[PDB]
Amino acid sequence: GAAILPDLGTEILIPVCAVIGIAFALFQWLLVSKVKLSAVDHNVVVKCAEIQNAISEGATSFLFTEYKYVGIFMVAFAILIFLFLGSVEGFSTSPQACSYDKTKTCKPALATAIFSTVSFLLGGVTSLVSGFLGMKIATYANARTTLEARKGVGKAFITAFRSGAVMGFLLAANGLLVLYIAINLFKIYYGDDWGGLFEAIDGYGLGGSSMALFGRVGGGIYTKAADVGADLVGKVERNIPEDDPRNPAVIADNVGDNVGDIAGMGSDLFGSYAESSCAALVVASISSFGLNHELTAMLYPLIVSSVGILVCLLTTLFATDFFEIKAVKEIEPALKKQLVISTVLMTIGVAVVSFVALPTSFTIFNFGVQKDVKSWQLFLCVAVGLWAGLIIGFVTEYYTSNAYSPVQDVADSCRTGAATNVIFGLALGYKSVIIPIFAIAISIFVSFTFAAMYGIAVAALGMLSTIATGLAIDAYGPISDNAGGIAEMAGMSHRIRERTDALDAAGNTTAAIGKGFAIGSAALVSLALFGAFVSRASITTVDVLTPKVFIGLIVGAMLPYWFSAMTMKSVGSAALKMVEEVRRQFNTIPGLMEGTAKPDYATCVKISTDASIKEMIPPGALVMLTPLVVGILFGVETLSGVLAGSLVSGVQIAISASNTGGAWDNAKKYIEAGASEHARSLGPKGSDCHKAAVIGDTIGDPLKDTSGPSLNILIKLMAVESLVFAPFFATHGGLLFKIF
Amino acid sequence: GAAILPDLGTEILIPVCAVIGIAFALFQWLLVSKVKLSAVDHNVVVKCAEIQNAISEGATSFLFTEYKYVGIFMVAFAILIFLFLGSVEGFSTSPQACSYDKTKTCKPALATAIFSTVSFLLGGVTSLVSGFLGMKIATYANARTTLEARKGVGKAFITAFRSGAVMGFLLAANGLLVLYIAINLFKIYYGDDWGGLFEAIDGYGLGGSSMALFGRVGGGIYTKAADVGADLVGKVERNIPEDDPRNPAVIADNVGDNVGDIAGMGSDLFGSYAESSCAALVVASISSFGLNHELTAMLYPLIVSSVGILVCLLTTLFATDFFEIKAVKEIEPALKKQLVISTVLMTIGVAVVSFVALPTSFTIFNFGVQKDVKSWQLFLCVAVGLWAGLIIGFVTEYYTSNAYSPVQDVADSCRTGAATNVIFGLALGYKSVIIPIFAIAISIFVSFTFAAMYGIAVAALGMLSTIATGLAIDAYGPISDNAGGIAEMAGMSHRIRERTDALDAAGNTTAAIGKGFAIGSAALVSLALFGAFVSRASITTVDVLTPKVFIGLIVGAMLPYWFSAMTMKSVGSAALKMVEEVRRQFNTIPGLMEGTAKPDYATCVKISTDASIKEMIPPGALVMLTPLVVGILFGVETLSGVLAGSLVSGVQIAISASNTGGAWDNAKKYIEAGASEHARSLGPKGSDCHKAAVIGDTIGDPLKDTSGPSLNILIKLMAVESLVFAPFFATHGGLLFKIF
Ligand SMILES: [K+]
Ligand SMILES: [K+]
Ligand SMILES: [Mg+2]
Ligand SMILES: [Mg+2]
Ligand SMILES: [Mg+2]
Ligand SMILES: [Mg+2]
Ligand SMILES: [Mg+2]
Ligand SMILES: [Mg+2]
Ligand SMILES: [Mg+2]
Ligand SMILES: [Mg+2]
Ligand SMILES: [Mg+2]
Ligand SMILES: [Mg+2]
């Protein structure tokens, strides 16, 4: 049954919304361009511009190198997709009867193999663009945030936030537009074969997350090598300020914020948005929407996202135009209010979309059967994802902000040395998983009960319906981070660093929240994708108490630990190298420590470049080889276990790692700031307590910036990879069992 | 089909072996008594005995206190077993159809509710006795190991190993004898109802692990509060030797070794032994062995354990009589030979038992169907468990001994400070899980394929078939640990401390191996119990892709993290208080640092005492309340998800935690001994590298001695607890779904 909103209306609405989002991004960039600087107080302005250029150059240079390797891997893997999918039906060009309707004829499997390859490359390119554009605005907005900090913490906040909004709206609108275009283009070939249309379109998220994996891990290793090295020798050893221009690692550190926390994060969340959308589309395509060719209801997830962009635009105006920050204590609540307002506004918006873009009754594919579903039930499916997100955001704030007791007790434990700081920090992260898990569990139960895998996929999208705002508050952080780095490097007044420090602490919490959203939506979309895989692979039942499934389960649960071992070890080894280099320069360049000789920044940049480009390979291979090795050797039943295991296990370590690291960072910020008697009693900077906090922070660096956040990609990527390769595994896989 | 060994032979063989094992343990205690000392070099022996008495008193005092609370808890919980199990049949006194065969009449459920309570209390008491006896021999042989260290390493090794043997054989023999006795007594009532007999007997393992959970957590919190406190103030802050008698936390530290690493560990492994034996018994009881009332084959597990005692006795003779240690490098291989020799001899033993105590063909219950199994197939089930163990031991030795690169690299990373030491340590533990998981997975596949749940249960018992030797090599460690503590506290020669340090380092490795066997066997037995739970609860299929099972799965995966948060935070807070107290004594008691005034040990003993008794409660509650809360509220489908996720997730954090902790300890021992130039280059004691290693070591302390090893109990305990209450949950549970 047709919805109120006709198909042509949907066809107009979606790109209009994307255009509006792109326009809004450009406008914000324009407003930020009003902050002027150049390399040609004149001296402070000039110095900021020079440091900005060093950072910009370093960041652009790394991504080109990273993206060159990743893009080569992408072409290699696209060929694998083509051959494996094509081999299912012997590359025949002959049409076959639709698996979703024997009375109809569908396009050849071969076409789906081709178009899956196309959408995969599309997703990879779009994901690269997401990270690059993010890096561009971040490296443009950093120094401008620094200069605005001369006028106060509120002005600086607005520059960093407007700029964060540039990234969020660009990424959400571009991701939406590309998907919309691909669908209309692919439809020209597929015609009424919507099952094949959307199965092919599903490659988009596969490409998105494939590149995101390397961007997150590569970017992650680069930044943490520099970060740990700079901080340990500078702050713990040499008793100099963080980001001091004498420190040879400071440039790599600040470049790192852009290539990891920005570019990597950007590709990462694009993968999230793409997979959730695509997962909804596949299930709907063989549900009544796709069967009755009802375009509007079929594109329900895209309409939700179209409205999300608009909702986030309005929300943004509240922080950008309706409220002023005057005191440091107002930053975190400002940020939180963006999550609150957008959620409330999006609840309404989702109700509107459910009311006008769905028929009141319809059916959803449910493991071979068409399940009767009502539109108010779908509304609750996406709304439960939306509200799970907000809950995750609140709990994550409680655990990572130095405004609350958990982080303050972590800082407090520094009184008894680094070891107690680490014990308290590990305990905090472990403890922090409880409510997000419960939130995710509730979201699963509601959405699974109402609309099976579609409901779940649409819950994932619900959690990411406010993605423009999520990205904005998140990207705000590394920009603020760079601003303090630039302030120190340019020798600005201590008042400037205090303001940036306030901004930066809030970004710590905000980064932990973004990670919570990414993990939450990854669990959701991966479960949806798990169910879809099972159908696509002709599995009747995934029975945990069979030998094949159970070994998959316990092995899948182990993968996130293997992945974490590799990434942690990489950062550890590179940082060890970094410390040796930094020590060397301090110990052997005359005048360096005295400030009359300049350090060699390039050598540190090279160390984090070499380690990242090299060491991103094995964990990337682990994730993407796993479904192929398990699918081909052991078959779809064992692979089923693996998917379930990696999901339920990976999620726990991802959450605890990110929050522990976030907590160590803000525990350190708390001591550095001395904004209360308790904080001051832990100081001043350089005290044993401070140094214990720095130890904790640097241990948390790879936890929250390399392994932790990348785990959500491990999960969601194997999930979509297995779905895309399901027919191939079902037909040609399980060799070990076929032999014996 | 009867086997070659008649029922009467089996009835005689089992206690004969137990008694032999008891005799052998007593013989060893005797040879150890040959080493003489008394508080009535003369002044060294006297001081050694006054110190031994101080430790013995503190350990006995805490155990009584701890056991007081646990026993009280044990009685309360026993009342729940009676009521809940009794409620299944409305406390009827009438017989009813067999749950395994409705054509037959069985003993009333109410009877089984009573015999379950009896076996529960029996197991609890036997678990208490297990811990207590271990503590007795350990606090007896510690000073004897010290005094004998005056004559060389070999001499001190033997005393420590003989004493470890006492605990290993007493525990194994006693655990067997009690089980055997309880089976014969219970059979008096049950007659031909063997299903009901062994269903009731299954309470034995429930009592054993229930009470072990508190013993591992309570003892673990006690010991680690002292350990972290003593080491941070003494070694990191005040630059004095480890175990220095001036340190007021040193008595609590050394008491703790016996109270956690010995008593808690002993209960822990008794729990492992009992659950494995019992789980095999419940499946077999409704297989052909139980239905045909063939006593020999039905007691296959107890006959395996009986031959295990004999094999281990033979194995012990090799380290004890046939060989001796001249060089410290011979210690670790000596202990590993115990594992290799016992594994090989037991392979032969299990072959013989399989050949003489089983019919060549029989059936194994398999989710309703009687499955045809051959004796050679059962042989491989127990053998694959046995060999999985040896593999796990080798891999664990590789990751925790400082004779190999991973630990040496971790020690090396100390050159760049505590933060790199910690990052490397975390990475190592994450890495160490790969092969054990694979070993476990292979064990599952083989045993599940051949003989379903019975096969898996029997793989679990195979891994624990050399439990006496396993316990010997492990218990050897803390005895050595204490011996070095006594050496330092008695101001003995530096050369004495060097010898015990060598003994101690090996003990760290064997303790990590012990934990691996416990985690390996816990995975196996819990999977077997899981399957049995599913049958007993009348679940047709555990379908991962249902709302009820999946929310169980993800939540159950979260539980080990929640458990770790509690236990890590408890140690952190307790250790923090300890540090403050030790500082207080050093800063306010005149003459203390100088050596002319005595420190108040009692205050430190009180800190760890108070913290442990209080803080053992909530994690105990979490583990014990979970099956009841989920089973009653959500039902057996959800609890099924919980059990699966708990197992596959908990195993990863358990292995990684114990091995990380072990690694940091031995990295530290490596630097402390300086037995190579690389080791010496990181020294000497008090260096920045040494201090960085001590930081890592004290972070690892709660990881490997509180949270990590208790995690295996969390898994195996919820597993039996679920099976025992299965009829109850199946009848009266799932309330939330029955209402709305
Ligand atoms: K940040
Ligand atoms: K030990
Ligand atoms: Mg830093
Ligand atoms: Mg940074
Ligand atoms: Mg920074
Ligand atoms: Mg930060
Ligand atoms: Mg950092
Ligand atoms: Mg210690
Ligand atoms: Mg100790
Ligand atoms: Mg010790
Ligand atoms: Mg030790
Ligand atoms: Mg220790």
mmCIF file of C-alpha atoms and ligand atoms in Angstrom, chain B residues 261 477-478 481 504 507-508 511, ligand 2:
data_model
loop_
_atom_site.group_PDB
_atom_site.id
_atom_site.type_symbol
_atom_site.label_atom_id
_atom_site.label_comp_id
_atom_site.label_asym_id
_atom_site.label_seq_id
_atom_site.Cartn_x
_atom_site.Cartn_y
_atom_site.Cartn_z
ATOM 1 C CA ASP B 261 47.114 -18.223 45.846
ATOM 2 C CA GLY B 477 54.962 -21.505 43.790
ATOM 3 C CA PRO B 478 53.506 -19.660 46.776
ATOM 4 C CA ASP B 481 57.207 -17.141 47.392
ATOM 5 C CA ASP B 504 59.690 -17.961 42.901
ATOM 6 C CA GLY B 507 56.322 -20.482 40.411
ATOM 7 C CA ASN B 508 54.940 -17.455 38.605
ATOM 8 C CA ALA B 511 50.666 -20.363 38.438
HETATM 9 K K K C 2 53.360 -17.178 42.219
#
